[PDB]
Design a protein around this ligand. Structure first.
Ligand code: RNV
Ligand code: RNV
Ligand code: RNV
Ligand code: RNV
Lengths: 396, 396, 396, 396
């Protein structure tokens, strides 16, 4: 049981573990595209004696954080331990080695999507975005008098084939990801993969269609089994006008009973309708998880709310350092100190605060965040909050 | 078809309409208790020719708003139109008369719980609290190392019969309702009714039990049909310690698979567990709806966030007046003006902002709130936000 | 194993067999009411050695047949064989004795509601009415421009308590039953029983309400478990205006999603709506079964369609006689003959034709009815058809 | 937004709208076959500016009406409005243009299958056939002593592969469609398509088998997911003997629990069994919809019941003309008149009466058909009734 960077000859063994560990695994062909995002020493495997019994890697990503700042991000992925080798310290050993490499390589943050919610907290990852499924019973849906784009004349939205308008989706997404916390750069190879999933599969998913606006798009397909349900896989809108116009078109899918989408808690859709209740929350879950690798770099890199007045405090991260944190004029300065801590929290908690999805006050109430000053709590809440609601880009 | 205040002889007809309109109607005996909260001219009926074909009333309530300010509140309730008399203007006529009476009587706000979400917006009511059902699979639930009250020694929580500890529930609730936005005074007659519902009914609900802490309680019963589900009807906790200790006791209901509760979006429960995902959101809906009757009085009465610096603007409510709004040092001044509006919104939108459940930014994105200044938007968001998360007291 | 008329001392044993044989059995108290409809020698029991192991009886009923003719009808009921004594000839023996008594007493027809559809054909009973369940999704239901009673002014329908308007229901039902084939006289004791079932039961059925028009009524209650479903137990309407007005009121039950009713195949409800499809047929089944006891008397007693021109034929009923049947001017003459048969059928088939629910042509296609002349077939179809659609009165 | 006949270059855009509008759409290959039934100017499209945002067409069909008369019929089909262009008058505009073309081309009737039941009434289409799903629990099914084809010797029914007996199916269907109201000529290209659907699809429908009699056939396949359910896609039988023999063979599918078929309300199947109840009606819906284009031509073309004696009346169709209607000896004469109307109805109502699926009396009770003479009503009922029960041929 030794731990190594994989060679080319290890990858058939890694794909076998992948097929056995991940039910949603698309085979080796699609893996080629994703592999191009893995840097030279971005992967570790565990061999027994040899067969691959453990693997983990990270991908080079670009993540937007509040203030429209783009951080280099290590995207943990393809993590698997063979069912033959559970409870053997393998996950801990692989995660430790990758975090060492990630830290040394100079990434300020790491990120992942969690298969289970009970695993990654102990390795310093905190849930940082919230997925929110809305299901609209579109048969009752009427738009409010106040909703944009309800005037006479032609529609600005076109119904199109995804593969024939790649350039427009790319450009709209690029604009979206740069202005929204949680945004990820989507490289060319992932557009290739996305548009491949758009066509129908024999005994699989139905054909995808697109609704295209100059400042937004929606990709949707009819569900495999529920033929009265349309699933919006992705809706990206840069303006409120685009968002409303796309939803006017989706509600116009008259052969459907229900439209579902995985969105974020601050999606304005409910408020566009005369009956807000028709946009039912059918599902909620953690989206992106963040591990802050370098506390000073991460805290100094993001923007903070201009509304809160300048304040200073001392933050201790458990086994992560202690810092003099000064926030004012939407910027933070974060420097070493041995002064008494005013705020303590584990590393995972900081990840949860970092994009503004969770309030300091809420985490304080669970005692995941410890302070004796409730004024400081309010100031943290306000400072770390995000002007632009945090969203989830794409799963990896 | 005339509109009158009911006499004693109208009430049998009103109870008949009630039994036919409300499936959850407890009969005339329980109605006696609720009736004591209806003031002298708090009710209207419509007769044909005579039989009661329409009714509506309000109750005298006390509602806590941000800054722990308690407002006299007209609680609209018992609203019904006979199925024989739909689409006849009756709801509009009854609501107009009651709003006249409520306004003239000097209530700054009216409030209701909505049977449907598409009805009450046009009468100036906006959803102001959010109900959030969490279902915990308690078989997997483990408390985080950081969670309070996990030390050795005895428990501070007692398992008791509700009817034998009325005084303690009353006193704990009184403390709770005064410090939480959305809190309602629960008068003696509603405690009588609550503790009557606590006992088992033949072929109905099972017996209720209570978990009692010095600074919190939980009332729960096993579900009628799903005998592995415990439903928490009510949990009131004044400290984080009480909240955690009550949840340690609920997770200790070892004969149950699942514990469900209707709570609020900022309930810290998920953060008390090592796996936040185990607290699944199974249901979300509008709670209390508010109609601001008097804009200046309401806006001046509540507290605002101290974090945001002093600012001035001009607010227009559609057919509700235009006001110079000045907010600073957590207080607002709201005075008449004919200066150009910087913010416009319908009356219902203001109700939705008033307890801090919805962000101005979110409503702006749906164009329910119109301004040309995005800095002003951020300032409104921050100012109207509530330090203490808004919760829902009891349905009426 | 002997067969006797029961004495008073046999009835506790009969109630025991009843409770064990019929899940819907209301106990001995309600049985008192039904017992008053059983004539002196209207019942048979089988004892072993003694305990009651078999029973059957008939009740004195009055049944409306086409031409608004009311026949004395033997209503077979309370038929049961102990589970200890199956496959022992007991049903055959009891049915033979009762049919002897019924014939000798001078009833032209016997009738029953069948627990199973495979039992009663061999004893000469044919299904003669069709039950048709319609479920309306009332949220989408809009009335057609052509539908009666859509004008301004007050409603003619009142929402009332059943027990306070007994006289009006009685009188409306009396008018209904006399003008509709399948109508049964409902005696006073069955009104007592019907209005007793109208009140709520602890852990049972919910309270019943009534919609009352001068020329019709509907009795309905919310379903026990599906609280968005209203079940119409009974709707009796003497005019099209009443029928439409009652349905306008039922569609006005705004707290319900669905209204269901057990009606007949020619219920005009679907045609009152702009979307006929909203009245979905969710269930179909045989209603009343008829055994023609005396062929000549039965065939001469009913009216026939005036449209078909006079014709003569020879009808043979298998082991039931052969007859010269002459039909003209809406009347039949039916006399003995030994002339060659032009039409043959079993006795059960004639029962199925008798109220016009089934077409001769349809039964001919199954070869349940044999003739070599297709012109005769068309003439039978037309002659036996009912001007007024056949309906089902009440179960017994 | 202009309205044109499509060119060859419009058809890729039409197929895109089709794939997005119709979930059951087989792609462009199968569309080639259906296209051959569309005449030169049988189609309209709406372009914006260009992309296809609206389309509609008709196909040249031959429809059998009572009296075995075959009418040229315009089969409306492939109707779709883009979800981006709802509530824009497009359906109304396309339907108006096609009806103009259909009328001018000399079709007496148009016909369609309705995606929803609330759409096509306002354009003068009335539901004219009823689909009736029967589900037989074949484990209990026993044939009645009277049922044909229960004697000793060999079976007349063969189990075969559909594709190897095309000629026999074609010839049997041709005989069927010519003698049954609702029958449609099935051209060669639709036989090609039907037999292509008969083979198994990977992750789709299972292989179809055929039961073949000299005077009937049944096509059936095991359901995708319910492997104890056999679905009869099509059963065509020219004699009662064939119908019974095919059902004896279907009940002999001993590996199945249930056989389902979409048939018509007068299917004799229930009467072939000792227990009629085993043939449960699981589903009912409108089949073919008719719009009478030319009232005189349509009414003069069909045969009427010989049983009713000669009578004369005056029929007014709303915005469709007024006519002296004389019916006798199974033929109608229909000529212009300005004499006072004795019968009024909308155009859609006449379509519903035309094949005898709905009774005049029933439509009168809903006030869709207005007369003051109830004798006239009875005469219409009898006259328009169909000797041969109306059935549904194939969907288009
Ligand atoms: C399949 C992994 N899955 C289960 C935990 C996680 C969620 N992933 C997705 O939703 C997009 S599909 C995908 N994603 C990759 N990161 C990858 C990688 C591949 S294939 C591939 N496919 C090869 C090496 C780089 C990572
Ligand atoms: C039954 C009304 N229901 C349906 C819309 C609304 C929700 N109400 C509850 O969840 C508590 S039960 C209750 N509530 C009342 N306000 C009242 C009133 C009564 S009984 C009564 N019971 C008589 C007059 C004052 C209001
Ligand atoms: C209970 C019998 N049931 C099961 C086969 C048949 C259907 N009957 C009903 O839907 C009305 S309840 C009823 N009906 C009776 N005929 C009777 C009789 C009684 S109780 C009674 N209750 C005593 C003797 C006369 C018949
Ligand atoms: C797909 C249309 N569908 C949805 C409303 C209606 C029902 N149609 C069927 O059940 C047989 S499949 C079919 N039918 C056509 N008429 C057509 C036509 C095609 S493909 C085709 N396929 C191209 C032009 C002529 C009509």
């Amino acid at each position: 049981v030794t731990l190594c960077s994989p060679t080319e000859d290890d990858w058939p063994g890694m794909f076998l573990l992948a097929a056995a560990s991940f039910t949603d695994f698309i085979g080796p062909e699609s893996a080629t595209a994703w592999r191009t995002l893995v840097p030279t020493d971005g992967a570790v495997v565990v061999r027994d004696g040899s067969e691959v019994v453990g693997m983990a890697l990270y991908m080079d990503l670009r993540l937007t954080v509040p203030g429209e700042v783009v951080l280099p991000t290590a995207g943990l992925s393809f993590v698997a331990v063979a069912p033959t080798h559970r409870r053997r310290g393998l996950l801990r050993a692989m995660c430790a080695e990758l975090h060492r490499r990630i830290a040394d390589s100079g990434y300020p943050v790491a990120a992942l999507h969690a298969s289970e919610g009970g695993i990654y907290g102990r390795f310093g990852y905190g849930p940082a975005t919230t997925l929110h499924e809305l299901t609209v019973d579109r048969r009752f849906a009427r738009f409010h008098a106040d909703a944009p784009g309800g005037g006479l004349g032609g529609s600005s939205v076109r119904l199109v084939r995804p593969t024939e308008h790649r350039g427009e989706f790319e450009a709209i997404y690029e604009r979206w990801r740069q202005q929204v916390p949680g945004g990820l750069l989507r490289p060319q190879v992932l557009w290739d993969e996305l548009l491949a999933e758009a066509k129908a599969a024999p005994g699989g998913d139905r054909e995808s269609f697109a609704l295209l606006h100059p400042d937004g798009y929606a990709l949707y397909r009819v569900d495999r089994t529920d033929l009265k349900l349309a699933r919006v896989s992705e809706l990206r809108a840069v303006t409120a006008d685009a968002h409303c116009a796309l939803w006017r078109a989706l509600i116009g899918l008259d052969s459907m009973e229900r439209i579902s989408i995985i969105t974020h808690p601050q999606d304005p859709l409910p408020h566009l309708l005369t009956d807000t209740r028709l946009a039912r929350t059918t599902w909620r879950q953690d989206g992106l998880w963040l591990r802050i690798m370098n506390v000073p770099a991460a805290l100094e890199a993001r923007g903070y709310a201009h509304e809160v007045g300048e304040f200073s405090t001392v933050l201790e991260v458990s086994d992560g350092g202690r810092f003099a944190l000064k926030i004012g004029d939407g910027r933070a300065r974060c420097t070493p100190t041995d002064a008494a801590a005013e705020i303590e929290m584990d590393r995972d908690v900081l990840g949860s605060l970092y994009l503004g999805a969770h309030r300091a006050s809420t985490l304080a109430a669970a005692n995941r965040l410890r302070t004796k000053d409730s004024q400081l709590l309010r100031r943290l809440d306000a400072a770390f909050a995000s002007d632009v609601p945090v969203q989830t880009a794409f799963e990896f």
